[PDB]
Design a protein around this ligand. Structure first.
Ligand code: CA
Ligand code: CA
Ligand code: CA
Ligand code: CA
Ligand code: CA
Ligand code: CA
Ligand code: CA
Ligand code: CA
Ligand code: CA
Ligand code: CA
Ligand code: CA
Ligand code: CA
Lengths: 413, 413, 412, 413
């Protein structure tokens, strides 16, 4: 299906073969784990049911071409809807059965599945946050079925994403009812997963906007505020998508670090936006700064990426319409994140940033700084200290110095 | 001296007097309350101490010119630093006593005061989130003094703003330590206000960025996430500044509604940015959509603006450098928000929006929708409902219709 | 449209949702009726059966709204065939039905255009394509549209951004693409001359979307291109409000730049959302933007001239009932009619012009007159400044002027 | 004084010396020319006259530390104003005499000088586009003096920059008069340079905004529209500043290519913005994509950078306040652009992009495409060709392929 016989192999950074990896060596050992284990790369997923069966075959062909172990899918992208909900689910069941056998034969694993509650017109007002309770019931039936399929196929995570949960205008929005109903829907899904013994990690993917004016899981901190408010934080981690970070006005590594220090870095969608375009372009990730600094955050996460992966939720350019461009595009993104891993790991091993940070904040490990951190110091004792009028000498933050190191490691590692 | 003898007075929407209110009639009653009480307008603040005393005289002259009942100040904006912290506080105490005098003779009240921990170079790395423990101690001494002065002058609120609390680069940032230390600082402040019996409402003002790349209290939701995480939410509401809403990628009314439904709409700074400029211009508020929709949110807040007010944290344009421009600018903003109050109050009384919202979400007050809201319905019963395959018919959201009504009321109320 | 009658003016107090609150087509404003000031335009089963039905729905909507002008794109009014010949046969057949409807209903064609955006052949652009075969098809399509524009009496003809730009400079021959864009536009000019097509040629700037950069980025950038290639004498601009803010400008900025360069040809009335980086094409509702747009248009030579105020806008995705098309045009028609009322009174009252006159009075006398005349040079200006006479600037009065704007929007 | 002493020297990519160039080897020959000549790096430029004289010393000390051959200055940055214009020019002349001798003894060259008509409050409304003719006269006297000084010191270019030439609001702007006066002023300057024999390349620096809402030289194409309209294009090239390109919504390499194909790539100011911050941050350039692609456009320019240079119009971060950070910051930017030159030259030498472009547009060098370029093809004949209905087959744009190549050369060159 992809104009490409054979598999893409690692050929080193000097190779001029456009169908070879320059940096992704799956077997390269980095800090005691292989690149394959560090990155856990995932790949995204005639008419009617015949087109669907052919899509199955093409998905696993591509997984074999790229030597990728993990895939993801949305229900409505693997099978067409029927004339009833029953027939929709029969069509899905049939295609799931084909996928399950391919997974067994090929040894491929389901990183996550999800429900597409975005495409069909019934979701024009959203799904959980719809104004039409009939749509909420259909959305529950659809996610119910998707949790069944996630359990059947052994999904390691299950994703809820922004779709159409937000608003076009606050003028016609009952904000409390929509947010309450979102929280009800998510808890109902948690209840159902527990009842069927589905032990995948639940993930929410923040997205700030597009196609809606505002979408409720705006960024990591906004989603965490909602999760904490509704007693859902214990059930959900975040699926962080690079382009959605920058759409929200943050760097990717900002979202990742916020997620990390709240125990909620669950998985990533590796792509990139165009910061001069206010929409979500979902380009395959090529920026070596973004991939280096993303893997820097991931490598410090408990268990690294953990049960998540580096998932290529990305779109070939409109002008890269040939089948082979799908292979070129993944090679672009896989080599960019493999280089990012190499560079990040060496930055971490050399404490290239950590030693500067240790020195920056050293005052909080001695004297009055230690007393602040320990809780001994209060406004009375801090004032008495400052009333000594000891000269205050700040230290440079060395931003340009560190930026030179980042450039040096990107090139030299 | 503002080149202006006497008071600005209401002269109706027909007046061509540039130094007269066209819409702010302080005694006009709207829904059982005067404009004065709805809006609770606030105004925000030779060398050395003589320049400082002159500035006090100019501030209360302006309060009298504008017939404004409330003012705000920052400590380092009202008095110069001395050669020691002791002398800085002596200078500040002397000016605070001159302010207390003018409050006596004029009856004007302190809406809030705050510590300016932005201007002096000791705060280059921040205040609570500084890398230098000596700066943390100075910041504590400064806020301790400001809480004393707030108590002494009867401040109804006390504001913490995000001046230097954030980062220039995550490369050199110990994020967890900075946020832990910000939470420690705010809790120490809470402790001290309780010890001295300072009963003002504590407020945090979100700001997403500028001057720094990222500032931690990015928007209402992000600040609420931090407050909830560190058990501080019970002590703080938000001071919402309109320009900071749009700088964060939200409308002002979005930030206000989010705060409102989390019980955290404490006060507002009334200004406006330029959405084509990304840098916090703090212009006086002139946009009648923004003022109407801000007042629409405030009127539905418990107690209206409550102990807060509509505070003109705004700057005349660089090209409006004459004294009289300060009066023109305030008339601009006071009339904009008075018109917004009139229009919003009639939109609420007529239920121009509430009737469309009521009909939009009516399905959640009966049938399967009521069972969703009550918790009776789960995935099993919702699926059984959806499996009936009853046709789903959504209703239009009528955005353009409501925008017509908004235009009509802004013009015709 | 689930609304059989005609929408009429019922004044500002009316609570009829299907009535104009500000657009009174007959109201006289500075010697001209609202109808002729604004020249409102409306922008336009399977296969040919669906095509014919859409013609009927178009003119049904023109009658509901009492609108005199319409626009269309060729590929939006007729389906393609299995050959170019068949595509033009389908197109000709629908054009014949539109012409009869124009005669019977009295409606006029503001402009037509060629849609060289949808079909996959234009993936790399039309005039700026990398594939010469596509350039040829593009020329054939515009040729046919110039013929239909002549046949239907189009007062303008529009070239718009579509796919003329780049996704990446890494693979772009910029000089060739711009040279070919100019070649294509000249050929079009050559052909309009042959058949006696007299309509005003217009270029619509768009800075980006779907592409990373589109070459007619804004008014000034398109003007730089037209001047470089000796095409400025043949083209004016079709200015769309959303494209101004997408380019980082206010709509009134683009309108004034176009106006002082004699290139304000026509407008597409809509609005974006300045918090969303994409071209939302909402029906215009912002009274500031509509007031200040009509302020610029009223000062253009002949007002909007041969152009019009064309509602190139889409209903919200959540406004999916037929009646919402009517509600949305009422929203935008009333917003721009109010804009005209306020702008005309501001102009009549010289509310801004008197302030501008005083602001720059220094350039009508003394050393300022010698600067303007060309008499003053660096030598005589230095001698003047070396007198060290005090410089006293005057306030720009921006906050004062904004209060006036608010007052007129509410009061006129 | 810069805490350094000695010269920064090249130590190669593996050095761990923070005070050594890792990529800038001034003597390395690349396509027949040294790095030093390719890049022509430029560096930017007690109270009263004593502080001014100390600044002269510190400037040339830094030029010797960095081994940089070119510098720039603004008149009001090198000498304080006097109590009269005569005194201002006497102060300026005295400092210019000191700089002239330093240039002779040190062998450093003046890349460009300019007039600062931004700081003093007389320019609150602008300079050439002021509303006050008295200010226009002062502006004329100041530029006249700067052209005198530029000729005396042998400036190779002379810069006009954005300052406050724009508007705060169109409500109070006579746009035609301001633009006419801008053109008059620039022609007066051209006249005067001719009269004194000043042979430097005149340059205009585009800037879209900040501090003003709109600045007239918005970007390259907008400035070119102005230069063509007023018959000034024959006299001016552009000084392209990287942060101003992105502030205007363009990439830096876009502005450079637009300048280059219009004969107007005169010089550059090498810095970078933050595309998530809406204001002009003027950070030292570190992004290897931006520096690579900028040197890519420059190397294809007639004569490369020509009489211009790669000028570091950049500011150290607020938090990098130690003197040594100035050295670290230039090492960061000089190594970034030296690496950019290495990578760009090999990309150009290998025709890594040019061969893909040659094939992409091959259709225009034969058949109907040649008739199009030749002018022979017209609408009648192109339609005849299209009416044969021959299959249209487009070829992929290969963007992801090309991005992989860019990444590979950045690492491997
Ligand atoms: Ca909603
Ligand atoms: Ca996306
Ligand atoms: Ca995703
Ligand atoms: Ca910090
Ligand atoms: Ca502000
Ligand atoms: Ca504030
Ligand atoms: Ca192109
Ligand atoms: Ca558009
Ligand atoms: Ca348009
Ligand atoms: Ca101006
Ligand atoms: Ca700059
Ligand atoms: Ca510059």
């Amino acid at each position: 299906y992809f104009d490409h016989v054979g598999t893409v192999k690692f050929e080193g950074k000097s190779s001029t073969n456009p169908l070879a990896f320059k940096f992704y060596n799956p077997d390269e050992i980095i800090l005691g784990k292989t690149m394959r284990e560090h990155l856990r790369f995932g790949v995204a997923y005639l008419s009617g049911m015949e087109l669907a069966k052919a899509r199955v075959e093409a998905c696993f062909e591509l997984l074999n071409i790229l030597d990728v172990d993990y895939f993801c899918f949305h229900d409505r992208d693997i099978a067409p809807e029927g004339d009833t909900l029953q027939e929709t689910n029969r069509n899905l069941d049939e295609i799931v059965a084909l996928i399950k056998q391919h997974m067994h034969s090929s040894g491929k694993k389901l990183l996550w599945n999800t429900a597409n509650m975005f495409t069909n017109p019934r979701f024009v007002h959203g799904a959980a946050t719809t104004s039409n309770a009939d749509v909420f019931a259909y959305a529950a039936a659809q996610v119910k079925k998707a949790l069944d399929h996630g359990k059947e196929l052994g999904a390691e995570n299950y994703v809820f994403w922004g779709g159409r949960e937000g608003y076009e205008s606050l003028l016609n929005t009952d904000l409390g009812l929509e947010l309450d109903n979102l929280a009800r829907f998510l808890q109902l899904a948690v209840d159902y997963a527990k009842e069927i013994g589905f032990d995948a990690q639940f993930l929410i993917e923040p997205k700030p906007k597009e196609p809606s004016k505002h979408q409720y899981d705006f960024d990591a901190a906004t989603t965490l505020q909602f999760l904490q408010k509704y007693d859902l934080a214990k059930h959900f981690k975040l699926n962080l998508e690079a382009n959605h970070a920058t759409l929200a006005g943050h760097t990717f590594e900002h979202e990742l670090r916020v997620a990390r220090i709240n125990g909620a870095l669950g998985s990533i969608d590796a792509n990139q936006g165009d910061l001069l375009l206010g929409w979500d372009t979902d380009e395959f990730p090529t920026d070596l700064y973004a991939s280096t600094l993303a893997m820097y955050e991931i490598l410090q996460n408990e268990g690294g990426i953990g049960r998540g992966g580096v998932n290529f939720d990305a779109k070939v350019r409109r002008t890269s319409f040939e089948p082979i461009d799908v292979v070129y595009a993944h090679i672009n993104g896989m080599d960019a994140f493999a280089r990012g891993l190499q560079v990040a790991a060496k930055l971490i091993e050399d404490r290239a940033f950590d030693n500067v940070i240790e020195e920056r904040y050293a005052s909080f490990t001695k004297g009055i700084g230690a007393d602040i951190v320990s809780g001994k110091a209060n406004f009375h004792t801090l004032e008495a200290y400052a009333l000594q009028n000891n000269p205050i000498t700040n230290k440079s933050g060395r931003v340009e110095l560190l930026r030179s190191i980042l450039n040096q490691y990107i090139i030299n590692v």
